[PDB]
Symmetry: D2
Subunit: 296 residues, 4 copies
Amino acid sequence: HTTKIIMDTDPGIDDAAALTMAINDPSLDLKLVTTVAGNVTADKTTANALKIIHFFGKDIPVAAGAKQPLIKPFEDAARIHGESGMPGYDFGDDYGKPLDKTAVEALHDAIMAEDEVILVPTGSYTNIALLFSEYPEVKSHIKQIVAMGGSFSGGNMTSAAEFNVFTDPDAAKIMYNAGVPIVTVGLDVTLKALLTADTIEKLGSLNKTGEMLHGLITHYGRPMHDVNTIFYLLHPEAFTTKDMWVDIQTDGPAIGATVGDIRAAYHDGKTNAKVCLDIDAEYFNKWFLEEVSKMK
Amino acid sequence: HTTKIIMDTDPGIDDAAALTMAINDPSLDLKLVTTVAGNVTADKTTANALKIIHFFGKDIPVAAGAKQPLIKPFEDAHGESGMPGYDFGDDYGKPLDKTAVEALHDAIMAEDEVILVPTGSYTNIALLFSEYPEVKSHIKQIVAMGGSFSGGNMTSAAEFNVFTDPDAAKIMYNAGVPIVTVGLDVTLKALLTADTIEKLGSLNKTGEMLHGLITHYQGRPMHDVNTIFYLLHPEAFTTKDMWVDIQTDGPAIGATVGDIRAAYHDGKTNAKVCLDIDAEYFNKWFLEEVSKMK
Amino acid sequence: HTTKIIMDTDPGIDDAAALTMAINDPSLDLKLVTTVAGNVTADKTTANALKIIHFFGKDIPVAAGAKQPLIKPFEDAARIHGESGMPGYDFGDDYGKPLDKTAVEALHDAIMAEDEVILVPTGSYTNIALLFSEYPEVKSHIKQIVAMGGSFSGGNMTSAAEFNVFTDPDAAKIMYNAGVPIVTVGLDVTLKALLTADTIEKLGSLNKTGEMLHGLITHYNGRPMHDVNTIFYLLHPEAFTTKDMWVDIQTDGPAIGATVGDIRAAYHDGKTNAKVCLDIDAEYFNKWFLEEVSKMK
Amino acid sequence: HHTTKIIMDTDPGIDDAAALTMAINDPSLDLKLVTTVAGNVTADKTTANALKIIHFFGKDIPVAAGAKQPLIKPFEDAARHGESGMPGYDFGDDYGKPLDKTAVEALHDAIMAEDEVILVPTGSYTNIALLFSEYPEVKSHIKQIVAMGGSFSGGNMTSAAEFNVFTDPDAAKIMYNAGVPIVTVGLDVTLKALLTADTIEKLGSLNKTGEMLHGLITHYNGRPMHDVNTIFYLLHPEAFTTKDMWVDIQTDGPAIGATVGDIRAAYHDGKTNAKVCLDIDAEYFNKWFLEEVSKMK
Ligand SMILES: [Ca+2]
Ligand SMILES: [Ca+2]
Ligand SMILES: [Ca+2]
Ligand SMILES: [Ca+2]
Ligand SMILES: [Ca+2]
Ligand SMILES: [Ca+2]
């Protein structure tokens, strides 16, 4: 048996590393990749997902999704224009075409086709919120959501908020209230998931995949974000977790905050997320190299 | 010329009267009816739209839409149709095998120009504009039942359709498509008189049907039908272009906040707000239109 | 045999008419007038209150209060600059001085001196919020608050909000949550309290007070009267239709300054914090206004 | 040879007791006044606790009791026994009485008496918000506010919010928008300010002050020290890493009580209102704490 997964992404170098591990691990069956707009437009994140899938010679379908957040106007200060949004390696132009259907339509069809799937959002959550609103019947087919985003110890857009949640707080609130079990892979662990200078050097000489990932990773040691959704699916024993109630702040100066009820004081003992609080960084490094060494 | 219109509804007696006028006026071509959940489930509002369309012998397609608001949990306040006072029978046909969003996307992209007429909460319109922003250049305007600039009905601050899905209303009001706001400011003045309702019941089969719905619960304020009355008789309304914001949290959740002084938005407007109505002409019009029907 | 009252004001022509009726009614004992900043700064509203009290020759102390709202920055487009903020009559320049103490300190001393008082806020509620936070012991001495402000049917700063609440929504929230009984005299009644052209003509020829009030009333220019309806409520509650309900104050977002009435009683388990004024006998308001001013200087 | 004039607003509290100990006894500091606010115990009990500490050192530095409740946010009753709120030592019953005036009134008089003072709030900020609203004239007399509270890396009431800000977010917003320079002594540094087992053992054997502080510090089973870091900042700012930034207070929603730092300087046109403490020399904090207490009774 393989675990059926669907990835919703805004590649993005971090998403490229997540997709690399998901595509190549033989215990995972990646059914579908959807994209959302982020630091580049949905047209560019779509092209980037196609570039990674084509690099591995796979025919995994890509569906382009939401061009904008539900409500929060996208910060143009965060919008890179006339660039790829996934720099540091030449993929060529031979990478194929997305589906004609939207990410929401593709998610609905791919989820309803499976008894059980794990959904893995590594961008802002706009497509997931739209999916759950238009097709709430998908939820019984989803075992778990393993989401990159949030922080319980300090943000990156402000002190209070992490990028994926901050980009579409309203979509994050819909996802966090949907009643599907969530694993929160936030900055609490991703800032600890330090790919060492020694690991990054070894990566660049390993094979064509290692050369590609080295190019993306070194373009700007490196904390790895989105790839920890896949590392959690394969090695949950590498993480320390805590079940808690998570609320999304959707306005005011703390817009985009993932607020954890760390005391369990306010929600009558109810939880909606398994929050990732720590990671084995040594095993993450060993794992990352072991996995890439088996690829092209 | 005929105006192409698409109606998004939660029938509902008020939506029944709106659909009746839209179906039967020869200057309007109703391409599609979509439904949303409200006082009753999306399954029941879908059945109610199909009952009205079938009553006039039309095969106007119905697509069932959103079962719940985007964010705000629906206030539960069993057994009921949600459109009582007339027996439509069995045999009213079936919805499309796609969502309201998918049906709206296909029907709007097939036309150069359409008018969109939401008479429920705005969930399907917000989902449509988020998933398919390419529809917006095909929409001349939105003529929306909802809001109030002079006192609400769910609270003092908020009208039902906006209150039910404030987040969807915000998405619709920020989408850049021209809006006409048909709020409580005019619908509470659109009083169908006791004399009108009596004449309606004896007029014909449509009059009998509308009489049955209208009198199920002296005179009745009519809501959603004023979107169609606006399309056909804009001269019967007093309007003011203004900036409208949607309050989406706090005690004033669901408020349509009009910048009545134009103090806060650098003179920009996103809505033509209906502030008054010729109630006498509304009554005369309502009877004249129904007299031409079955 | 007199009702002890304290007025917190931002005069303002409407507050001048309220103070006029309160000073001159023999069933009322106006112990103190406090001021808050509004369309003009607190120094100007203080001067305006002193002008009205000095016009009637009374001993009534004035204490200057808050210069700014608690939290919401005062909208500069609503600030009237290099002006009195009470135009249409020259009182001269011999109107006396405020107390040395703040409005809050003067309110605390005047309320604690009475077993029972009625508080009558006709500006924004900044002083009352500060008072209840610093000296919650005053609340057992207050029989009720009769407040000018709010709307349950359309605002004047936006469609959602009335000026006095809009000006300091956080102060209004503190006041509305304080557990002192409130009567809300909002735009629902004040926009119906239309002083007719016939009344305003008769007012100007009545006596010195009528001449002074005519000067203030007709400076911009029939006229809706606001703040004076707090005093008309105290003297003639039979002139009003009221409804006890739960009122929340919106303190942020586009509906900032909204008084939200739970008109269905759906959300508060049947609890009430305000008696909301919904209708007024405008004919009696006119008759009363003329009858009262005819008994003055 | 010259002293810094300071005023402390406190809710003692073991952490405030340690802050007051250092402030009372440092020869470069002149503590003019202590005010109190309600927190984990009532304002009556925090007042008693400040008087106990002052009396322990043979001083009669005045204490003025302040606000009994937050401005707006109902006090979380799960966060309020027949308990002192400062256990682990018998201070006896000879500790004297607070001033008759409120904290606000005492703060206004003490600040206006000085050309320059530093204000040091170690509780929730209710008294400071009321002070700045009623007496904005104090602000030109205040060089700086050195505040215990906030976090830019994880809270203690929720993931988003620290206790002092969470307790009265509205008061914290008024303080952060008042235009007086702020030094933020948040959980970023106070959770690193670990008084070691070795330090706490040496403290207990040092003298009567060390015995008293040992009693309070070891009552609940090193120890992170909070409020005392305001005084450690005043004396040894070189022991801290700071960054000027714009700080907003979240006053509603699930992130209520958050101190939101514009860490990118993306949203406020490069304007700052706070010098945020991000790191501390914990080794020097320990050395300093022992050196200071060794010079006391
Ligand atoms: Ca990403
Ligand atoms: Ca769709
Ligand atoms: Ca409807
Ligand atoms: Ca005071
Ligand atoms: Ca006034
Ligand atoms: Ca403290």
